[PDB]
């Protein structure tokens, strides 16, 4: 609801960057499941994660 | 996806011939202009033919536009250490009468030194006065003609790399499909050119954006352990010690070894001490964690948020808050291609089945659009209020586009057309508005914003007062009337309700 998760399986996360239809964001704390949100409401309708 | 902002610059414009037999081109010539558009979006270029119908495109995928700065010069700076050897000897012939060298005498070599290595790198070849006696080495009262050479090594092989730049040009990427079905990327920059490839010379334009505090900053990246920082580094050959900039050498694989021929350093970069026939050496070489304003990879400084974009030729990026640049348009020239066309289009019809998205917003309202025919990409729809082209495949197959729409209620007849044959749609939907998004704690920005849709502001008449009443264009009256008969009971409720209440506050005391 608050928006998109990164999962990673091999190791830890160092950085990295997500794109959305007109938002992008990034954002890093060192976990395996890390949450990146990018505003409230931004993402309304269909579109295309590209991380 | 979608596509929009369409040229038509240099339709029919062709110098071909019977083109191989049956039909094909040979070359097109001519210049057009991208205007600017929103990250995540496509510009198509379509051409026109006079003898085909309808030709292909060239769609134009913007991602991030990253504020880089540009690439002043190149070097890389390896560790060094602390190295130094002497030797003891006596005179015992007319070789250190008074002193060591004569008049000019530098080679400080006698056929002993370790000097002739391949890792022994930079050094100096320089000499020193010694002491007479038993003690001292000899058994004459003479001074002793003692040499001592110095050095630097590299036992663990770290390799930096620097890149001076004072520019900061705002940048973009771009990913280019070409209508034979090549796709490929690059990186344009602001004004400089982007390494044309078959012709195409698309580059993009900024707005020379001022900055707050970045005067003297540097690019300064790490190798092996992939470390970035943000610290003032030095300038090209010509520099001063007391900050960075210590010894380079010519590249990268040969950064390994300090050896000379690549290797440049100007003077005092090492020091000497001796007391008696020991020349021991100190280090004073600094690391890159010594001078000041040394960032790391995550900088805040000033509005910039600097963060580490992983992406080729560049790690350097940053995005402030929303600014709504002034204008990003591009500039596209040709010089030659090749490109096949038809002119086999048979009939074709299609139909609309779905229609939702947003009012005139940024990602727009997306229509779902049907079709069927046997040739593999031959549409072009045009319509009032906004144009959209497409391609499609062989078969029948359903494709999703978005438009450009500015009434709430879209109910109107476009013209629709695949390459020679043309047809007649329409849609009918219900649309919803959607405003700039608000600013959320914890989110920041990546790369940039473009524009958002603040123009209107003001409420309608129209479609305001919708669901208050009702439908009909005859129930329309007598929604008005059974609202307006509730809120005179409820008002009059209300005025009992208030009357009642100044009654009882007045009594009773
Ligand atoms: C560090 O930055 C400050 C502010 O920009 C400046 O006054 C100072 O001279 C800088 N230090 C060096 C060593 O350049
Ligand atoms: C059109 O109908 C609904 C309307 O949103 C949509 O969910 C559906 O996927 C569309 N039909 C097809 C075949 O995609
Ligand atoms: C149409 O597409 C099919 C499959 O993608 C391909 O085999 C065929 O060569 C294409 N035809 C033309 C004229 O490009």
Redesign the interface.
């Known amino acids: 609801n608050g928006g998109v998760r990164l999962i990673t399986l091999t190791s830890e996360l160092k ?13 890093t704390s060192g976990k395996k499941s890390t949450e990146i ?6 993402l ?4 295309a994660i ?1 991380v | 996806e979608s596509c929009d902002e369409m040229v038509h610059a240099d339709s029919k414009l062709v110098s071909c011939r019977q083109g191989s037999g049956n039909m094909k081109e040979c070359v097109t010539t001519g210049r057009a202009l991208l205007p600017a558009v929103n990250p995540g979006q496509e510009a198509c270029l379509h051409f026109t033919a006079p003898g085909s119908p309808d030709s292909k495109c060239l769609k134009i995928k913007v991602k991030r536009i990253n504020l880089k700065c540009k690439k002043s010069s190149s070097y890389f700076v390896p560790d060094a250490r602390s190295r130094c050897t002497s030797v003891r000897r006596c005179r015992w012939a007319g070789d250190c009468q008074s002193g060591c060298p004569p008049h000019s005498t530098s080679n400080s070599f006698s056929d002993d030194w370790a000097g002739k290595m391949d890792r022994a790198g930079l050094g100096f070849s320089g000499c020193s006065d010694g002491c007479g006696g038993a003690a001292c080495g000899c058994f004459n009262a003479a001074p002793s003609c003692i040499f001592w050479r110095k050095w630097v090594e590299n036992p663990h092989g770290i390799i930096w790399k620097v890149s001076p730049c004072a520019a900061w040009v705002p940048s973009a990427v771009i990913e280019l499909t070409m209508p034979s079905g090549e796709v490929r990327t690059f990186h344009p920059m602001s004004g400089i050119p982007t390494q044309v490839f078959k012709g195409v010379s698309v580059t993009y334009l900024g707005s020379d954006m001022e900055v707050s505090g970045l005067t003297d900053l540097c690019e300064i990246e790490e190798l092996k352990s992939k470390k970035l920082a943000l610290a003032p580094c030095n300038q090209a050959g010509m520099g001063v010690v007391g900050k960075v900039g210590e010894i380079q050498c010519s590249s990268e694989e040969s950064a390994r070894t300090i050896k000379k021929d690549g290797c440049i350093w100007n003077a005092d970069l090492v020091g000497i001490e001796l007391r008696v026939d020991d020349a021991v050496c100190y280090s004073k070489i600094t690391s890159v964690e010594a001078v000041a304003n040394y960032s790391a990879i995550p900088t805040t400084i000033g509005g910039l948020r600097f963060e580490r974009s992983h992406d080729s030729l560049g790690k350097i990026s940053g995005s402030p808050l929303d600014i709504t640049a002034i204008r990003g348009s591009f500039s596209v020239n040709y010089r030659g291609l090749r490109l096949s066309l038809s002119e086999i289009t048979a009939t074709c019809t299609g139909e609309v089945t779905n229609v939702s998205g947003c009012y005139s917003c940024m990602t727009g309202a997306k229509v779902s659009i049907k079709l069927h025919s046997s040739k593999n990409s031959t549409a072009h729809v045009r319509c009032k209020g906004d144009e959209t082209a497409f391609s499609v495949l062989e078969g029948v197959h359903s494709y999703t586009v978005s438009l450009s729409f500015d009434h709430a209620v879209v109910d109107e007849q476009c013209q629709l057309n695949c390459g020679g044959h043309e047809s007649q749609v329409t849609l009918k939907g219900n649309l919803i508005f959607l405003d700039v998004p608000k600013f959320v704690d914890g989110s920041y920005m990546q790369t940039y914003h473009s524009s958002v849709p603040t123009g209107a502001n003001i409420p309608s008449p129209t479609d305001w007062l919708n669901a208050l009443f009702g439908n009909g264009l005859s129930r329309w009256i007598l929604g008005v009337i059974g609202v307006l008969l509730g809120g005179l009971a409820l008002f009059f409720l209300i005025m009992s309700l208030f009357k009642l209440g100044t009654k009882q506050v007045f009594r009773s005391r």
């Open positions: 950085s990295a960057t997500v794109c959305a239809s007109h938002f992008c964001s990034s954002a949100q990018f505003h409230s409401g931004s309304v309708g269909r579109t590209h």
